Amino acid sequence: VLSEGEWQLVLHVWAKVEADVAGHGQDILIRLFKSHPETLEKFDRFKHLKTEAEMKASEDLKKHGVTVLTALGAILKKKGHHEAELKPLAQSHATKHKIPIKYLEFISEAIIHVLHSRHPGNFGADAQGAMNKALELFRKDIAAKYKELGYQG
Numbered sequence: 001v002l003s004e005g006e007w008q009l010v011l012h013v014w015a016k017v018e019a020d021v022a023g024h025g026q027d028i029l030i031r032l033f034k035s036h037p038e039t040l041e042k043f044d045r046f047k048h049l050k051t052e053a054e055m056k057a058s059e060d061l062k063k064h065g066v067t068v069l070t071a072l073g074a075i076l077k078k079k080g081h082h083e084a085e086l087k088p089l090a091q092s093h094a095t096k097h098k099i100p101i102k103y104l105e106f107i108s109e110a111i112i113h114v115l116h117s118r119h120p121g122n123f124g125a126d127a128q129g130a131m132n133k134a135l136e137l138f139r140k141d142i143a144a145k146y147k148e149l150g151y152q153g
């Protein structure tokens with residue numbers, strides 16, 4: 001369970017993200033695909049992209065990144081009260097996309113890398129700790145839902 005103070009560190013950096021969610025989404029997805037190329041293979045729409053340049057130039061990848069970060073933003077703003085938001089996401093990611101928890105750890109890593117790089121003003125050690133706790137909470141709740149749904153994850 002996060003403290004209010006932890007949630008405020010999370011939402012303070014998220015507010016900066018929201019200055020340009022499309023750019024942040026591109027950086028995060030590209031970092032994920034570069035750091036863990038196996039994750040790209042889950043995306044039938046994107047797995048043809050060969051290079052970072054192709055990824056940066058993809059309008060559809062940018063749109064998807066906005067979709068992803070907007071969903072996660074909505075989850076973070078619930079400050080842990082995210083049961084309703086998690087249900088459809090867990091279902092799609094378990095049953096249609098088949099995303100293991102290990103891959104959710106990888107995208108969590110990518111989020112943290114990007115925030116650390118872009119926002120050292122609002123992502124010092126304490127703030128990163130808070131964001132890690134929020135993402136661990138998300139992953140723990142997603143893992144419990146995967147098990148309910150029948151997916152080992």
Ligand code: HEM
Pocket residue numbers: 039040042043044045067068069071072088089092093097099103104107
């Ligand atoms: C912060 C974690 C994540 C969030 C908030 C998120 C959010 C979303 C959202 C909102 C969608 C669109 C609706 C849906 O199908 O549920 C989506 C689609 C998808 N997600 Fe995720 N996602 C996350 C992590 C992952 C990861 C780690 C992978 C793969 C390694 C993944 C693979 C996919 C795929 C393959 C689709 C369908 C893409 C398409 O339209 O072609 N997601 N995700």
